[PDB]
Amino acid sequence: GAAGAPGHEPLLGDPFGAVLRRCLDGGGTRDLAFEVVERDDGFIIAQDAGIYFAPPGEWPPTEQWAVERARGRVLDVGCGAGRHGLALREAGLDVLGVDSSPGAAEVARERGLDVLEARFTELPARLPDGAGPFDTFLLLGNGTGLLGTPAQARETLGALAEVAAPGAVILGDGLDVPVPPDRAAYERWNAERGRPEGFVRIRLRDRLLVGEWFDYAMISPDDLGRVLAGTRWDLASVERAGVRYLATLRLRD
Amino acid sequence: GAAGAPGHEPLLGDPFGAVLRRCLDGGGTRDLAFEVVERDDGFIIAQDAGIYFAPPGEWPPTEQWAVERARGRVLDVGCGAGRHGLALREAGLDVLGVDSSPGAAEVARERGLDVLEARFTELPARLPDGAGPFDTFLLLGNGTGLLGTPAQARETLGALAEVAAPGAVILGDGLDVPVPPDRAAYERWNAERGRPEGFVRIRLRDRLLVGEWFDYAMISPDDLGRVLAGTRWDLASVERAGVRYLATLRLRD
Numbered sequence: 118g119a120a121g122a123p124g125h126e127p128l129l130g131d132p133f134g135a136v137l138r139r140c141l142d143g144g145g146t147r148d149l150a151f152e153v154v155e156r157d158d159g160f161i162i163a164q165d166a167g168i169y170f171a172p173p174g175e176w177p178p179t180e181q182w183a184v185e186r187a188r189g190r191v192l193d194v195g196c197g198a199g200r201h202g203l204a205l206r207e208a209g210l211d212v213l214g215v216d217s218s219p220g221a222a223e224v225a226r227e228r229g230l231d232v233l234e235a236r237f238t239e240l241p242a243r244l245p246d247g248a249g250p251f252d253t254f255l256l257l258g259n260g261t262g263l264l265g266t267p268a269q270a271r272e273t274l275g276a277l278a279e280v281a282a283p284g285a286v287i288l289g290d291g292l293d294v295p296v297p298p299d300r301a302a303y304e305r306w307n308a309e310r311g312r313p314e315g316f317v318r319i320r321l322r323d324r325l326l327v328g329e330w331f332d333y334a335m336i337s338p339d340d341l342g343r344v345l346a347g348t349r350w351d352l353a354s355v356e357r358a359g360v361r362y363l364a365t366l367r368l369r370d
Numbered sequence: 371g372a373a374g375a376p377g378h379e380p381l382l383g384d385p386f387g388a389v390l391r392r393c394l395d396g397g398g399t400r401d402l403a404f405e406v407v408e409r410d411d412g413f414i415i416a417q418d419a420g421i422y423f424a425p426p427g428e429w430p431p432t433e434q435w436a437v438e439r440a441r442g443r444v445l446d447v448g449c450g451a452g453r454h455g456l457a458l459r460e461a462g463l464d465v466l467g468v469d470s471s472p473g474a475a476e477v478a479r480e481r482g483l484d485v486l487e488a489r490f491t492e493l494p495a496r497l498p499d500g501a502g503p504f505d506t507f508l509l510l511g512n513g514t515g516l517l518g519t520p521a522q523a524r525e526t527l528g529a530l531a532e533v534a535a536p537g538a539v540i541l542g543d544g545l546d547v548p549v550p551p552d553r554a555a556y557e558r559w560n561a562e563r564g565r566p567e568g569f570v571r572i573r574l575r576d577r578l579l580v581g582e583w584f585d586y587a588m589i590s591p592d593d594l595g596r597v598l599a600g601t602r603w604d605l606a607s608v609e610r611a612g613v614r615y616l617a618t619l620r621l622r623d
């Protein structure tokens with residue numbers, strides 16, 4: 118049974134940024150605020166917003182490796198509260214963040230990171246002329262699964278190519294997870310609806326705010342190679358730590 | 371917009387116990403599993419399930435005081451994963467827990483607490499003859515707000531009276547919180563619907579499980595005294611720590 122009644126129901130908004138702002142205001146520690154995710158079948162999962170404020174030593178190893186390898190002019194793509202870009206800025210690198218959540222951008226700015234609020238496909242138009250071109254793009258925090266469906270992902274990758282320096286790389290992490298029977302049932306629903314395998318349609322919920330539906334996935338390295346076919350990016354290497362991986366994508370002409 | 375479609379929608383079940391079981395299986399530490407609460411207007415809040423496995427030193431002070439004052443035969447009413455009763459059992463007391471969630475009861479049992487799975491009003495019928503009568507009842511974890519609406523609360527208090535020893539006490543904690551404009555709007559909806567002030571109608575959500583709707587409240591000490599009028603329990607004392615309080619209710623003939 119669905120909750121809500123006309124006049125007493127959740128409103129479209131920025132729950133992601135609201136959660137981050139509450140967490141920051143409380144000290145940016147764990148167990149202060151939680152990100153809640155609802156799938157389009159009503160599946161509910163949550164995450165502690167403190168992970169967006171954790172120091173480099175507490176990140177998954179795939180994220181640590183990406184930040185240890187970053188060089189040159191860096192774009193932190195979907196920077197959240199800025200944890201990756203902030204670490205690079207303190208290490209002396211030229212770093213810019215981009216996030217679509219207005220509240221997330223404000224939090225990241227408050228912490229000290231320059232951030233453009235924009236959808237990724239809008240980057241070539243909204244960036245200043247003096248920004249970039251970028252040598253390293255960060256797509257961290259299951260970044261490869263936040264590119265969207267293959268269509269959307271190739272559109273984002275094309276925008277990144279337009280603002281990339283020759284020889285640029287994407288350092289993007291992802292998840293290669295087993296499929297429980299629950300998840301297999303959802304994949305059957307994807308096929309009935311003519312949707313790509315591996316993707317879920319989810320949104321964030323917080324208090325009486327709901328976010329817009331977006332596509333999310335745990336993409337294996339092999340499925341990532343198929344997305345890159347037709348784009349200027351090549352999968353160059355993959356390193357694994359358990360179910361996580363860090364992929365290096367290399368740009369060509 | 372509501373999530374879910376016929377055939378791909380959440381099912382009635384025991385999300386509370388599912389969350390506790392996942393947390394225990396991971397070591398019972400923080401940031402493993404989260405309790406997600408949905409109000410009947412779609413308001414979403416979450417809590418870390420690790421709080422149900424925390425040691426006495428990490429509890430709110432009102433809960434610590436109640437366990438420090440417990441004496442005699444103890445009933446832990448709504449014992450969750452058993453944290454309060456387990457602490458008393460290790461200190462040498464005769465303790466029994468009661469919870470309505472089958473999964474919660476199993477977790478508490480696995481940790482070492484004797485637990486009856488029952489609704490509170492069923493206690494006189496379901497308890498063995500050799501159990502009790504009880505000198506101390508624990509209602510901890512905003513316990514006074516989990517008694518339900520005044521009607522339900524007086525029914526529970528009557529059941530506890532039937533299994534109480536002469537001179538028994540309830541040690542019950544609660545929350546005396548300010549009312550934000552959001553919450554004031556919900557209180558106006560309560561009045562439109564002929565519902566008691568202070569109560570919210572909520573349910574738990576986890577994965578594709580939903581729990582039953584139940585009533586929940588943050589009741590001030592003065593409102594608690596009104597509930598007790600008509601029952602054999604008297605509000606004897608209140609001690610405060612911030613917005614939390616610990617009330618001692620004393621049984622009379």
Ligand SMILES: CN1CCCC[C@H]1C(=O)N[C@@H]1CO[C@@]2(C[C@H]3OC(=O)c4cc5c(O)c6c(cc5c(c43)O2)[C@@H](O)CCC6=O)[C@]1(O)Cn1cnc2[nH]c(N)nc(=O)c21
Pocket residue numbers: 148149150407409413415416417545547548553570572586613
């Ligand atoms: C992380 N936070 C930082 C400060 C320390 C405390 C903590 C916190 O704020 N909430 C923690 C998180 O879970 C608690 C317990 C939890 O168990 C449920 O099933 C449930 C239903 C809930 C529910 O329906 C509602 C609310 C809160 C609900 C709630 C719960 O909240 C309202 O807030 C909005 C309106 C509404 O409908 C808390 O333990 C209660 N709590 C304890 N101290 C409190 N102080 C104030 N001011 N508000 C509180 O709520 C509160």
Ligand SMILES: CN1CCCC[C@H]1C(=O)N[C@@H]1CO[C@@]2(C[C@H]3OC(=O)c4cc5c(O)c6c(cc5c(c43)O2)[C@@H](O)CCC6=O)[C@]1(O)Cn1cnc2[nH]c(N)nc(=O)c21
Pocket residue numbers: 154156160162163164292294295300317319333360401402403
């Ligand atoms: C607390 N846990 C203990 C072990 C360590 C990891 C952690 C954990 O299990 N999930 C953590 C918690 O948030 C993550 C990130 C988070 O961000 C979102 O917006 C979101 C949508 C999600 C979503 O729609 C779905 C799922 C998971 C979603 C999810 C997220 O999950 C599926 O699980 C069910 C089906 C589905 O629709 C995680 O970071 C991803 N993650 C990282 N390692 C993982 N290992 C496996 N086996 N599964 C994972 O998921 C995973």
Ligand SMILES: [Cl-]
Pocket residue numbers: 163164165166168401
């Ligand atoms: Cl988490």
Ligand SMILES: [Cl-]
Pocket residue numbers: 187188189210
């Ligand atoms: Cl450099």
Ligand SMILES: [Cl-]
Pocket residue numbers: 226230231232233
């Ligand atoms: Cl900025």
Ligand SMILES: [Cl-]
Pocket residue numbers: 266267268269313
């Ligand atoms: Cl596609």
Ligand SMILES: [Cl-]
Pocket residue numbers: 148416417418419421
């Ligand atoms: Cl919590």
Ligand SMILES: [Cl-]
Pocket residue numbers: 440441442463
């Ligand atoms: Cl004793």
Ligand SMILES: [Cl-]
Pocket residue numbers: 479483484485486
């Ligand atoms: Cl038992």
Ligand SMILES: [Cl-]
Pocket residue numbers: 519520521522566
């Ligand atoms: Cl009532």
